[PDB]
Symmetry: D2
Subunit: 505 residues, 4 copies
């Protein structure tokens, strides 16, 4: 007999595992427990802070929910109006020394005239070929060219995506992008070129809220706080080292054993295979591909410069900087960095030189958060990446050479993005059912490896839905039908369902 | 306060209500109750029998299940292997003196050559147009012609569908047919014409199962029998006459009042609006369209004729008979008609003449079940319809003038088909949300009026999913996403879920 | 026996008849003669002069030659360099207060932006339709729309062509426009819009040459003069009143009869039929359709205004003027109007008022030549048309209200344009063979009634080729295959051929 | 000064040269003469006779005319009704044991059902692709697939065409075939499949005439006979060995020199370049391609077999025989072989064996004429080709093993077909204009190397039109516009033109 026994064991307390926990806690039927190797829940949705008091998420994290259930849990956890700030998405693409509103491909109207001609010519070819097309594109690259034309492909789509995915567009599928990549209408784009107009509102994150305190990580700490503490195990005491699928037994690092009837595993599925010592699974998970994410944080002295303004996040397709994206993280909440009265010495000028004075001085302060991808196809020099980022900020005019930097942050996250490669699905339809036969629900950003349902809300609901399938025979809709859930408001499942209303009488 | 109070009241015990009731019973949480005006559950999936012992469903009823859950409940209700008979899905189109295997277009080699030429030319036109199409069809008629071309459409789908829906194809939408592109398989059609080949869409793996006893109605009696009797109220004692949606009270014909928190209604939504005395809803529901169904049954003496053979159902596009569909119901089970030793006198010969003798003679017997549609656009003379059907049987060569008829059946069903008109969705998206705001889940063939999810399995699951929405916050997928549920096997929901396993 | 007998008789000494005569004269085989009701050769390619000394062609006459033989004859007739002036082919479309360079569609950058949007949207529709088109257009109107799209068609070609042909575009065929596919050059149009530019279809290469003296009519006078005078009969003495086809006899006004073996008739084919007293042909020829042309000439005091500049001809789709085309005729030759030192009183001002003084003053002068069409579908009031034209000049800002008009000219030409109606070919394929069966070659602008081969060079060559068919068995290519002769360099036939080189040795 | 001086010299007295000569003789202006290295004119339109009295043309020659001028000359040369026989075309394609009516691609209905399916599927594919095609095919092979689909390309078009052209379909252009290769209509073809009907009437040789005596060579002997003998020089005395284009001098084999003003050359253009000692022209002509033609004749004893019947010519795509075409030459005229009473011994049986008896037996007789192509991509064994042909006749059931062969014939013609290669036009546009600028008109099947205008009537008319361009400035329509002359009735030019009628008075 094992040390502990539960009907449902949840591994991991990022958004996916917490979703499982929350639904299990609502149903309040089967016994359960949730473990995490980190004392602080949140996973890639966590927040670090520098010794100087600057917060950094794991890159730009902006919340946009497709589900009422997710909203219910966030509102429960952070119930007050001043727990949140609401912002409009102000996003731009750095191109040729200018800021082009997102989406690029719908704002051709802002480029030099010569490039406008190239882009519109390319789009005209695309439109005429689309008129007679009777086959679907097979690669991301093919998709880009069919919907945007070469001009736009070559100018922004191709270089930016290599810069983010860390694999060429020719290596990825295209079934995943309905809600990620705006497809330009020929007439609309041409109309804006003629009028000199802009169109900055495409997409599900055009308006967003952000937690007042603790960064994104504050959400998941507060959500975890609503769970019964005795059913949790976070820290070194909660680290899973072995999974024995056949005895339905999990062994923790400190030697504790947990028996289960059903397993919801939210750790990276490649790690789960290793932990299962299942050599067949190990070989299959090695057919998946992922990229690593470097997060660089820069704290800057001064009131927010006019050139920065209300910008939220920014795209960089060009070669004068190594990052693909920057976030004005200090725009998301005044508690993301120190108050103006805080005294801090300058560490360096943006041009790389030493400050004229070592003396601690006051603020105010603003804050830039940068992302750089890495993979076997796109290596990164880890030793110079911080300095390269800072020079890139100067190159792109986001920082003046004489700006004073008071804090720096750099952390590499090994599993950053699960890549939608051509091979992804053929591999997953082997992996997931094989795990499913053993009563293991592997779910989440790396649990199930599907980026198109890979944000905080998708993840949370993958966990909720896994439980709902285990207990109530529900369809796992987010897992198997991303386009279905992303194309509708999912209003039906609530934190208080009829089951609880009727039970309370 | 009312005579009875429950959390969830279910009106109607056809497949939909019995679906809600089965799921409520499984969950065993909130209190509930189910009523029906009829003593015998089953609704339009019931079975009648003539005084001569010939059974008739309400027209051809063939089960194709899209759901494990539906299968679980049927298996529980009729668990023995000899409770069912299995058959191949064999169907033919009657056209120009021939029985053409379904699907029609793959079998036009049976027609005269000059006609084959017209059909192929029309389908060539359709293939060439499909190659440059950049719009979706807007009507059932447009959809038909883009799939088949003019010649083939005019022979089968156009005239057949009028005889079925009792409205012209030009007045129906085509979204209910699903997402498949409306375009010909020109190569498949031309290949069968060149090879002079025929081929139906059946075989050892395209089968259905039919109940050994009691017709389709036997299924729902057996399913209803698995419910706790005290939670059911079927018969005159269970007839709903009034629905007060504001008080959440229902009133039965015998005076009994029932209070509910959530109502799952499976009666025709147009009767619901009347029972609610809601003038706005009456006005809206009267904008929906439906056709009535006449079922005619004919019992015939003799062993199964070779010309009939293993045929199950048959389509009739032509105007030499009033029915759109015929079913060799005696092929579905040996118990749908009397055994060979039963003695029955001949009532009349197929040509309408009197028999030589009035004496009772033995069988064996076989049986034909026919459907005739009626609407305001297509009247049916109730006094001559049986005789007109029997003549139709002679005209189509199903009966010989000499065949001996030993039993007849005729019944009219007012709500038969809910029609996919062009206006249907515009009307339903006003009606259903208005009922939802009053905690009324109106669901079913005429509860929600959507034919593409109007079979026995869909209906059942509509009731199941409505309950699952009420209790567990499930998405009502069958209701809102017919293409979704029809394009997959729905395996997740089971008669025994984790919930019940963890409890015991 | 008739008064005169010749092998080949030519009726008419416009360009077609002169062409037949030039080739007959060069061949110097069969006997021949040429007659005309007018003392001056030239036909509709003649030139008039006002009492004040302003010349006017029969509306805008600009030579574009498809044939070496035509060039040879023109060069023989006027061999000196200073017999001609050379100009670029400069034309504009008057539209919404703007002079838009031709071709209209490449210059819509001049229109309001909202209008450019509607034009480009229409042309995008047309390009998408053209990509899947599998039929030829059947009417002029369909051809216009397929080439331009709706918005651009409605601005220029549709309303302009009604004002030109005096019949709706939906009533004309479109085969006469040639074999090019009816389809937009969308990229060329959007490119000029994006770059905000204009460009006309003229330059150092795209030029025409115009006679230095006597207007277009001076050409035909000088060509006729190379013919042996004794073989010509121009004037009342040459007016044909009767053609007896069965006897091959023609009767002139003064009672003279001419016998022939072959007849080349260049008179209007409906007059030919009447003169043959052939009731069947009279019936067929009345089934043809033609418009009449009003030519209005206006002489203006002053040096050439800057707003007019180097303009040659101008198109008017709009209804603030009755003319469809204007020509800056004083730009064609300094001898189209009086010298600067010639003195003329002002007759009126452009706004219709009387001059302050009635005295003769000096120039210089410039000159405007206008064209107005008339048909049964489009009446013209002959008594107000001059004054309506002059008001048109003010409305279109060609003249200021103050400009001084020193000469006016108005003449109506009954047969002006042979109309390419839907019915034209059905009728002509009945008429021409019946005349052909009688050894009558009816050829010319109204001799054979085909506008697409209706220019000066086409006409001349219709005569040449008729003769070549009669003598040498040549194919009549211009008559029967307009697209063929218009699409190639016709260099083979020369004013000095092998036959003449060999015979002179 | 040379021995002889003429305005126009014609080299070669095949149809092309004779055409020039006839037109020169009709015009009767410039002096001229015609030379040939052969005593008997006719060129590739000549006829041989075996010692046993069997005639053979140079492969199947059938007369079908696009031009009245050609008819006038043939009728003058052979004016009696009994000088000619008229025949319907009875043509078939040998395929899988069956005779499939020509054209193959329009009689799919004759094949076995299984091949019908493959053929129609292929055609459906081509029909759908053609609905959206916006480019022209570049090669003969692409044309074949695009217009007939793969099934018919593989079954007939590809193998047959290599067998005739002696180069693969991928190496030929496709602008030449308007009148040679029927394009199948999907509806028409499938309709006949369904009804089991044939469509045997496509093309310009569906009816033809053949001369009663002397075979095709009889025509050209007779035409040459209408010329003034003193202007002809046929035989070794008329063999051209040198052409000096600068001096405009030609030198004959016997040392005779002829000066000319204009040269019409009809010998193969590669021979002309060598005779000119013009290395650059030799280089260019070596870029052209041609195939050689082996003609095999077989005389057979017996009344015409029933399996043979009224068949005229037959096609053989399959690899069970070397010939691409057989002609039942005895069906064309009773005088193409000996009378029935002529006694002849059997030379061999069709199975290859000798008869022992040398007895001369009577007829009647019938006759088969075969063609085998050869080129550097398709060698032919000249020593066995006769026997291989005869075995081919047995394999295809043309001859029974026991048939008695009484005469055999074999001759190789080096220049047989001028191949329409991809490179042909690019090469001819360098060659023909260069010769033109030296006053050399190179014309004919190998004079100008264009197969689409390479028949007897085309060739004759190339010579006629060259003279007409030289003397009368006529357009050379046959040379430059094959589709124009092939698509119309060419009635204008006649043997007696107006010029001769008028001059005779």
């Amino acid at each position: 007999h094992p040390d502990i026994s539960v009907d449902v064991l949840v591994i991991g307390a990022g958004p996916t595992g917490l979703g499982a926990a929350k639904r299990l806690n609502q149903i309040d039927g089967p016994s359960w427990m949730i473990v995490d190797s980190n004392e602080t829940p949140g996973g890639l949705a966590s927040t670090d802070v520098t010794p100087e008091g600057f917060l950094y998420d794991v890159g730009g994290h902006v919340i946009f929910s497709h589900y009422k259930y997710f909203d219910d849990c966030l509102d429960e956890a952070l119930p007050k109006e001043d727990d949140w700030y609401t912002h409009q998405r102000i996003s731009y693409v750095r191109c040729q020394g200018q800021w082009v509103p997102y989406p690029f491909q719908n704002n051709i109207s802002m480029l030099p005239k010569e490039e406008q001609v190239k882009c519109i010519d390319g789009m005209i070819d695309a439109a005429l070929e689309a008129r007679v097309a009777n086959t679907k594109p097979k690669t991301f690259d093919e998709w880009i060219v069919r919907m945007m034309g070469t001009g736009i492909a070559d100018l922004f789509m191709r270089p930016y995506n290599f810069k983010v995915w860390a694999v060429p567009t020719t290596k990825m599928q295209c079934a995943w992008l309905g809600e990620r990549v705006a497809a330009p209408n020929l007439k609309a784009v041409t109309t804006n070129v003629i009028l000199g107009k802009t169109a900055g509102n495409w997409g599900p994150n055009a308006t967003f809220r952000f937690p007042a305190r603790g960064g994104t990580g504050g959400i998941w700490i507060a959500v975890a706080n609503t769970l019964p503490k005795e059913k949790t195990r976070f820290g070194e005491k909660g680290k899973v080292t072995k999974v024995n699928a056949n005895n339905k037994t999990v062994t923790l690092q400190d030697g504790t054993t947990i028996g289960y009837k059903k397993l919801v595993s939210t750790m990276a599925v490649d790690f789960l295979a290793e932990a299962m010592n299942d050599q067949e699974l190990v070989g299959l998970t090695k057919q998946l591909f992922y990229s690593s994410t470097h997060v660089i944080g820069v704290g800057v002295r001064g009131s927010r410069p006019e050139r920065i303004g209300d910008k939220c996040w920014l795209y960089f397709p060009e070669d004068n900087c190594p990052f693909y994206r920057a976030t004005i993280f200090s725009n998301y909440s005044p508690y993301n960095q120190p108050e103006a009265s805080a005294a801090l010495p300058t560490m360096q000028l943006a041009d790389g030189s030493r400050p004229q004075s070592t003396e601690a001085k006051e603020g105010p302060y603003w804050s830039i958060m940068l992302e750089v991808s890495e993979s076997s196809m796109k290596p990164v020099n880890q030793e110079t990446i911080l300095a390269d980022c800072i020079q890139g900020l100067v190159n792109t005019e986001m920082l003046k050479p004489t700006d004073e930097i008071v804090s720096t942050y750099h952390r590499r996250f090994d599993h950053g993005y699960p890549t939608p490669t051509l091979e992804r699905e053929g591999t997953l339809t082997q992996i997931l059912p094989k795990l499913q036969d053993k009563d293991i629900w592997s779910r989440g950003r790396f649990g199930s490896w599907r980026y198109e349902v890979g944000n905080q809300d998708h993840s949370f609901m993958l966990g909720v839905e896994a439980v709902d399938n285990i207990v109530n025979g529900a369809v796992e809709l987010t897992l198997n039908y991303p386009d279905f859930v992303n194309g509708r408001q999912n209003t039906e499942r609530r934190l208080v369902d009829g089951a609880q209303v009727f039970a309370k009488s």
